[PDB]
Amino acid sequence: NDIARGFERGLEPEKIIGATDDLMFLMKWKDTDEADLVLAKEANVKCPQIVIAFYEE
Numbered sequence: 440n441d442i443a444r445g446f447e448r449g450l451e452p453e454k455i456i457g458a459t460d461d462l463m464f465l466m467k468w469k470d471t472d473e474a475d476l477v478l479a480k481e482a483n484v485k486c487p488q489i490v491i492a493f494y495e496e
């Protein structure tokens with residue numbers, strides 16, 4: 440889970456580009472070309488609309 444502290448970077452999420460197994464999302468950050476793992480449990484709460492756009496895919 441330590442593998443997935445992307446939020447601590449303090450950037451704004453933009454878009455989930457992937458997932459893997461505790462469920463994790465590869466999160467892409469706004470305006471940069473960078474992505475890091477964050478825990479789905481935590482993304483649900485911090486950026487629910489973005490979590491949801493990932494599912495409608």
Ligand code: NA
Pocket residue numbers: 485486487488489490
């Ligand atoms: Na959101």
